[PDB]
Design an enzyme around this catalytic site. Sequence first.
Site: not given
Lengths: 242, 230, 243, 229
Positions: B138, B140, B171
Amino acid sequence: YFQSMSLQGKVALVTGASRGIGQAIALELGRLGAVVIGTATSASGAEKIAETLKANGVEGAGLVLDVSSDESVAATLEHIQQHLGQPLIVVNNAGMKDDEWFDVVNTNLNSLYRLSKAVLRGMTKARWGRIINIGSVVGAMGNAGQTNYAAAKAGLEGFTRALAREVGSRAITVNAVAPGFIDTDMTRELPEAQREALLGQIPLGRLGQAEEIAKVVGFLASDGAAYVTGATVPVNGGMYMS
Amino acid sequence: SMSLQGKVALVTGASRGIGQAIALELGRLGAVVIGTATSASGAEKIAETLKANGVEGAGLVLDVSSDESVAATLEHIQQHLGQPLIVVNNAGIEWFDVVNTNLNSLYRLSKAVLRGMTKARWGRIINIGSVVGGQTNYAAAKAGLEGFTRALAREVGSRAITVNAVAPGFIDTDMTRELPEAQREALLGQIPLGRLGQAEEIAKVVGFLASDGAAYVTGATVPVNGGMYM
Amino acid sequence: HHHHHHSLYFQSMSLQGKVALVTGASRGIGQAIALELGRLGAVVIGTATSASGAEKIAETLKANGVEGAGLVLDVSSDESVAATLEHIQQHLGQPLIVVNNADEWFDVVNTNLNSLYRLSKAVLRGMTKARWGRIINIGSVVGNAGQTNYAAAKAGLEGFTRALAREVGSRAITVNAVAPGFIDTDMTRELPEAQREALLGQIPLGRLGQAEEIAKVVGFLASDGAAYVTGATVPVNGGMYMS
Amino acid sequence: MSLQGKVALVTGASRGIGQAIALELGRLGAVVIGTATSASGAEKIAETLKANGVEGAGLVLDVSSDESVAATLEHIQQHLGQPLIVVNNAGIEWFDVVNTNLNSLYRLSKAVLRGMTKARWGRIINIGSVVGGQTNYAAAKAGLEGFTRALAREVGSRAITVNAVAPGFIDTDMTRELPEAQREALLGQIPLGRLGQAEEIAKVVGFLASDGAAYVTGATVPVNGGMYM
Ligand SMILES: Cn1c(NC(=O)Nc2ccccc2Cl)nc2ccccc21
Ligand SMILES: Cn1c(NC(=O)Nc2ccccc2Cl)nc2ccccc21
């Protein structure tokens, strides 16, 4: 009255609303249906704000507010509560050498904190709010001008992020907008050779308009930006200094 | 008055979740929307969704990893609908290969649509980051997206084309709805708003960035994460 | 009545002849920083807010053969800062190496930065005269509540450090910061095993840092070799980055 | 402390920053293998190391090539031992440059990780490009920072640290021939009011390679005299 970009039925407070960006923000939130209270530190400024709002068919008022004063803040908020209602949208816009940075930033953040705290009780009661902090425009060319600018932006970003974390559970968002070189008072200190050198550091090759800051503020105030919080949105045509 | 009437938008990965929401929102703002997927059934489903919401446009099959697919698809769009001046990259997919691959896909597609944006002296390119739901991949992917977006924006700005990114937090989507409850609760505890974002809330941001009012916003990555920063 | 002022060649000794001031030097990281700068040959003045703290510092310095002193200093007070600095000037010389290690979310950060600014400004005259200096600001160790405060304090420290570095650079004074992650002190050793192991899982190195490991970084920044490093905040957190 | 008993590999070691890094690690007691892409470069490196009493060698290495990397590492393993300190300084529009470099960093880093894993100890240090425009520089830095941070997370459990050093305006072959208008404009943007020396980058690299920097990982240390783009 359940519509997406619309601020119908909401009372917005916009500090430093008498010229430039503050004015543009006041008209934009007015255009979106908010009742707008613009402030200035003088009575002439407050009068000018009222004139501008009527001339553009925006309901609201100009008030005199000194964000540095606990008394002025308390008194102004009370006045707003009695006559217009609780402001649930609040936009803080009220606010050379490389040794000026500290006091300027320190002073502004104490003012942001003071005002933000005062308006939180009403936002907490309504379980809804928008606080939007406007950063200082890049305000002198050269290196002293960059220092002050980056410092003020670092503090605003960190402050905004921390406050957003504190108040999020109450469905109040807290964001910032960080202007680059905008067409305003700072921009009209302007020898054309230095101007062209400035436009060469901005990929869009132009200065931003005050309206372009105001549009961003308007989106952040909307229901659609409800999951955006703790953000600082740069509005600088691609010119990043820090 | 925040309106895209007369503009053709391309939205990759538009058959579900955030891509879908972005396609509908740009449609709602008046754009003609071309949504893509990697299969024909996906492409068909996109068309059906657009009609069901009264949006003009089309579903196409596009593989962003392929130079041939990209070239062919763009030509198809040029013949039948016109030049896409709003482009939203939402299609994506070892941390190293994932990020490396995605950015090559962003570059490939972005380069292809620049000619038409250059000709029109106007454009909007908006890159959607990967949703949260591990931490390494995430962060990166986000670091690469931010840097990529900022550089491309600098390259193309003289042409009045803006390039921005939207970085979602946690989300509510098909991929996240059935994460184990322990991980879900751990994620809600890290989010000040105390809830998951909706796909529509990403779409609203994308919509603003595509508008004329966001013309001085470029090179930005707007986080949409309810206050949770990782 | 309590007293507030308590005053073979090693290859490490490269700060030879330099006077370092280290605030908050009585325990943990501040102590480790005082010994490390002592080990590198500096004359070390460590401070605490009490006389017992100041005494403990002097005892530690002697026990490790470091020349210097323990003083009482309150970084929140203009009077304390002025007085202490004068005292240092009369008796030991001008400190050219200074290490700051001494609704809550706002007041904490705001107060600290005013303290940094107060002290930094006071020591700048002597550094300016010598055309040389090192100012190093130590961030808070990590410790909902404890992440917000942490990221806020770090954002302020970074922006502060960077601005001050720009202001004073022309005088060949560098200004840097060190941002600790989870450091091993009294408080983290006494955690329940489940919570401790959950913490170590967020740190790629899989361990807590030692106070000495912060002190080593501070020592390098104080050296001549870090003369082109300024405005930097060096994270020392075993790979665990909280934004 | 020192690097006595350690083998360091320094790519791009024939001039400037790479050279200074090779000598500094040599000075701290490491056995140093410096690389260049040509044989003359490799020869020059050996000559420099002997002239400064540093044990080691100059090799020819092309970081863009899987074959060159594999072959060179094997050679180092047979004759000198496993390199546990590795400094990537070899590098090379904006997109291809950064993309290519990071693939090189990844290629090389992966190859040296087996030996570091076996020793349960390591240092990987990535040197950014010297400023020389602002787009390429910021892009290359954003990628280096993110890459460095991700790799550090992947390999940390093994007590291998991974850091980067981001030079500002350094005094080197490439910057010596810049026109004295652009020079003065750049000095005015650098608070220290001067260019950095290659040795000043080398000192930072040396500290990161030490035992005292063992809790520093995933960091990019800027060495730019206060000038941040
Ligand atoms: C005085 N000051 C402050 N003051 C301040 O209160 N900062 C702050 C407070 C709460 C959360 C974040 C920050 Cl940055 N921040 C600065 C950043 C750069 C330079 C000066 C700053
Ligand atoms: C593969 N990769 C890349 N590759 C890459 O080309 N990044 C990049 C490309 C163009 C402009 C900026 C960047 Cl950072 N950046 C990374 C950052 C973090 C982790 C992996 C990354």
